[PDB]
């Protein structure tokens, strides 16, 4: 089966740690696994005035929100995919599994 | 006819049809990404949402 697992999160270190854990499980289970494909990141920019009133020098704030997304493919039945995704998950990392 | 003339004016559009979800003020709304706040409440609540200053 063509099984695709999508991981999208905000932090980068916990995302890399859980991706390393998943690829380590795929390597120790001895099955064909695609590499960690790194999609381009998206930034959410909101620019707003600092002062609440209309007095002062025209100073502005710059907010950002980096979003990192990975996807790793597998060749296995579904129960292996669920039992390998439901092990040692991180709170700040979303996991999302579909089959084509 | 007060039951029909209480809210007979349409509010399908305009800036009076929008409101902040914190203080309900119809000025300086942030309609990007569906925050739907004013700018002051956004600066108050920006850190715990995930928006940080790096640039």
């Amino acid at each position: 089966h063509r099984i695709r697992i999508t991981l999208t999160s905000r932090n980068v270190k916990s995302l890399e740690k859980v991706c390393a854990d998943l690829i380590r499980g795929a390597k120790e289970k001895n099955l064909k696994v695609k590499g960690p494909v790194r999609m381009p990141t998206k930034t959410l920019r909101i620019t707003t005035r600092k002062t609440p009133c209309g007095e002062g020098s025209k100073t502005w704030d710059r907010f950002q929100m980096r979003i990192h997304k990975r996807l790793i493919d597998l060749h296995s039945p579904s129960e292996i995919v669920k039992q390998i995704t439901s092990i040692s998950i991180e709170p700040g990392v979303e996991v999302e599994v579909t089959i084509a | 006819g007060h039951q029909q003339l209480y809210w007979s004016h349409p509010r399908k559009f305009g800036q009076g049809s929008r409101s902040c979800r914190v203080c309900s003020n119809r000025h300086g709304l942030i309609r990007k990404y569906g925050l739907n706040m004013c700018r002051q409440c956004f600066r108050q609540y920006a850190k715990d949402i995930g928006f940080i200053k790096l640039d």
């Binding site: 905000r10 959410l44 979003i67 997304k69 | 990404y33 609540y45």
Partner: peptide, 19 residues
């Protein structure tokens, strides 16, 4: 789910919910 809003709006709604 038929609606399934975008990845930006998901993190936005999650942040609004936590706030």
């Amino acid at each position: 789910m038929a609606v399934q809003i975008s990845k930006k709006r998901k993190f936005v709604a999650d942040g609004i919910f936590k706030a």
